[PDB]
Design a protein around this ligand. Structure first.
Ligand SMILES: Nc1ncnc2c1ncn2[C@@H]1O[C@H](COP(=O)(O)OP(=O)(O)OP(=O)(O)O)[C@@H](O)[C@H]1O
Ligand SMILES: Nc1ncnc2c1ncn2[C@@H]1O[C@H](COP(=O)(O)OP(=O)(O)OP(=O)(O)O)[C@@H](O)[C@H]1O
Ligand SMILES: [Cl-]
Ligand SMILES: [Cl-]
Ligand SMILES: [Cl-]
Ligand SMILES: [Cl-]
Ligand SMILES: [Mg+2]
Ligand SMILES: [Mg+2]
Ligand SMILES: [Zn+2]
Ligand SMILES: [Zn+2]
Ligand SMILES: [Zn+2]
Lengths: 386, 385, 130
């Protein structure tokens, strides 16, 4: 009924309909700025007068049951937002800034949103190597990437295919984000002492077949998780590394004996999210044949290649892009990578071995998908390196 | 609470009668799912209404001597169950999940369940070679394979035959599984610092003849185990490798110098369990000669080759399988292999020597049992990747 | 204090007891050249080298052994080691310095005496796992 209620209701509506992940309500010196994050990038949504800030912040706080009187400290909560047909769970954060409290609302995905592995975006050759890796009966499979590059989606996509009812599937998550039926899920509880490592150790007395480790971030968790792969369970675990090969060296640095890494690691998936060209303003462009050679492609790939980029329309808010698409780097462990691990070879040398044995780098997968007009050269060089 | 009690009793009794190894009491969104593991795979048992969860978890915590008040942290303990002819210990573990605590109950085997070596399922020629190795007066004999592949059964089967009253037999275990009479058993106790290595060092002052190391997980344990063998004790020890030759390279990788391996190691047994085809719905099948070729079957053999599967019937729960069977790959160390180790040859090179010397691989052993209809070919290929 | 250690320590003797091969069932074994090689023996030395064990007889139980014999590692401190102590180099570094200036290790000493039939190589290898 109030204007603030009406603005909050409207902007969540817009976020839902546009697949925005985050709403930012930012006090500035002489107004309030509201931005939506869509396909990973912020874009402007609207502007409010400074006088509208406390009414809007209150509406958010009430939603999450936060304290309106407390304005000098950060607060955070959740609300299940239900309006019209919309039924979305939201993470609500409030923070003091020099011009007032800032609000951030995150729209949380559900189990219904997890795709089957066939729609994960894998290129033809790498997808065959992918499902062979996830098909192994035991070992540790690492999934690596910076925040919001799709690690959880990939992880649970896999478990949707392989966590069959003849097996016990057990997760430890921080927090649990999806209700996946058929698997058993446990949330780390800091207040209680239920750390990652503490729960992992208990899983070994829980007759598991598949263990999912949401975060490997201390040495004990790294050692137990590798131990569970070695003894004969399938372990799917997430790591922050820039690279597939670096996940191997990271485990080492974290104190996992190299001979256990060689013995248990079945592979490493590195991934990123790139933006998809908007169809409705998609247009062909001509690339410099040279700029494709300096990026690494041979002349047969340059000969057929047509590029695309979005011009900017209402469907895409002028960006040229709508939605995102994954790009991958899949390291599958074979004998030669095992010997390199035992021999202490560097990340760089391990990468060379993986490539000679057929690993496509992140950039190479990116360019391939660019030559299919899925994304731009722009985006491939934005989100990758040599 | 009495209806809870009534249910724990019947599920434990049924698992025991059905030869289930594990009971899973799993709280879900709206109900409580209950599953039995039989022959390594899980089956549905029953479904409870979500209201029954706490009554059941409570019955089970009390049975194990666990704390009803503690629901935020995991708990484990042991259950000494007695109820008619049924006499079974259970390892009990409770664990917080999003929908409440999940309980797991593992049925523990006994000394009376441990077979004699002649009933381990060894093929004729391999059995004689096995008898040879386990009879050597000193050296380290390694039993390798993933979890639940029969390693402890084989291990205590051997000790049943060689652990005689004129020897001191001593084990270090995590935990001690069976109380075997005639044999000294010591449990890993980390709350007190008695680790695998700590015990193993102590054993060397215990005038042993036979030492059984339940698990060689770290480099210290590998070295003391090898020092035990080099000192003149016989050592039965368990490792996690995918085949026999890889046990040799793993000892090197863990820091045992090849000249120590070469002097200490008498043999490696890799093994797996495959499900056993249900006799009641067994059906002959005609093999794919492309497959039999690719698995190295001489066309002489491929001509008489028959394979088998269980159709799936009431007697095997529609699984096509009832019971399990073991498959082995026994690598016996001789002079040629001893040379290969000190010459630094790879696991692949060592295996090719062993095979030429007559060792059948895991796949070869399973293939030969599938050719008799003991198991399916599919089950053999699923445990030999 | 490392400076007090450097000024005072004149040497360190480390030792082990190995079992002694019985004299009445002693017998030759052809050693593997590779074993001796990886034990740091010169190829000239390998040419002649023979090893021994006890086959077991009435005079030694069944054991093949009777009595014990010592094997030695003698670290004699010089200016360089003194310098390494002051500096604070590790036990492994001191060991390689002392070995370079000519210190034989336990296993080298053990092998030498095994090459004369005092003990088996297995006894030596048993005693010298670092
Ligand atoms: N394969 C994919 N293709 C397109 N978009 C994807 C894909 N996977 C994930 N996304 C989008 O990326 C968002 C974040 O993905 P996800 O939670 O899997 O990332 P994450 O890397 O686990 O992030 P966090 O850092 O929060 O753990 C998802 O909500 C979804 O919108
Ligand atoms: N030779 C065999 N034939 C048939 N079944 C067997 C055989 N050996 C073991 N089993 C079955 O497999 C179960 C597990 O065996 P065992 O405990 O020896 O495996 P393990 O490899 O020691 O497992 P863990 O890795 O947990 O120690 C036994 O309880 C028994 O049911
Ligand atoms: Cl990304
Ligand atoms: Cl939980
Ligand atoms: Cl198995
Ligand atoms: Cl001594
Ligand atoms: Mg996530
Ligand atoms: Mg066991
Ligand atoms: Zn557009
Ligand atoms: Zn049947
Ligand atoms: Zn004698």
């Amino acid at each position: 009924e109030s204007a603030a209620q009406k603005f909050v209701k409207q902007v969540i509506r817009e976020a839902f309909l546009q697949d925005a992940s985050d709403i930012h309500i930012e006090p500035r010196q002489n107004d309030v700025q509201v931005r939506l994050r869509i396909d990973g990038a912020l874009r402007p949504y609207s502007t409010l007068p400074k006088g509208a800030l406390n009414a809007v912040i209150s509406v958010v706080k009430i939603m999450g049951g936060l304290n309106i009187a407390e304005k000098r400290l950060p607060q955070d909560g959740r609300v299940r937002y239900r309006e019209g047909a919309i039924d979305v769970d939201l993470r609500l954060s409030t923070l003091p800034t020099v011009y007032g409290e800032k609000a951030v609302m995150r729209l949380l995905k559900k189990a219904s949103d997890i795709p089957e592995i066939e729609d994960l975006g894998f290129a033809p050759g790498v997808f065959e190597r992918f499902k062979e890796v996830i098909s192994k009966p035991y070992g540790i499979f690492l999934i690596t990437g910076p925040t919001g590059s799709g690690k959880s989606f990939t992880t649970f996509s896999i478990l949707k295919r392989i966590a069959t009812p003849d097996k016990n599937t057990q997760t430890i998550e921080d927090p649990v984000e999806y209700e996946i039926p058929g698997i058993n899920q446990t949330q780390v509880n800091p207040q209680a002492g239920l750390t990652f490592a503490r729960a992992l150790r208990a899983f070994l007395r829980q007759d598991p077949d598949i263990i999912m480790v949401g975060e490997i971030r201390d040495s004990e968790t790294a050692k137990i998780a590798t131990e569970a792969a070695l003894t004969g369970h399938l372990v799917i675990a997430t790591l922050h590394t820039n690279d597939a090969a670096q996940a191997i060296t990271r485990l080492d640095e974290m104190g996992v004996e190299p001979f256990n890494i060689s013995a248990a690691l079945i592979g490493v998936l590195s991934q990123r999210l790139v933006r998809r060209v908007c169809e409705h303003c998609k247009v062909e462009v001509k690339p410099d044949p040279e700029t494709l050679r300096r990026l690494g492609l041979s002349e047969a790939e340059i000969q057929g290649a047509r590029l695309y980029k979005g011009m900017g329309c209402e469907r895409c808010g002028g960006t040229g892009y709508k939605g995102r698409y994954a790009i991958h780097e899949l390291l599958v462990v074979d004998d030669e990578i095992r010997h390199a691990i035992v021999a202490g070879k560097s990340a760089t040398e391990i990468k060379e071995i993986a490539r000679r044995k057929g690993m496509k780098t992140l950039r190479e997968d990116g360019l391939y998908k660019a030559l299919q007009g899925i994304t731009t050269l722009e985006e491939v060089l934005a989100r990758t390196i040599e």
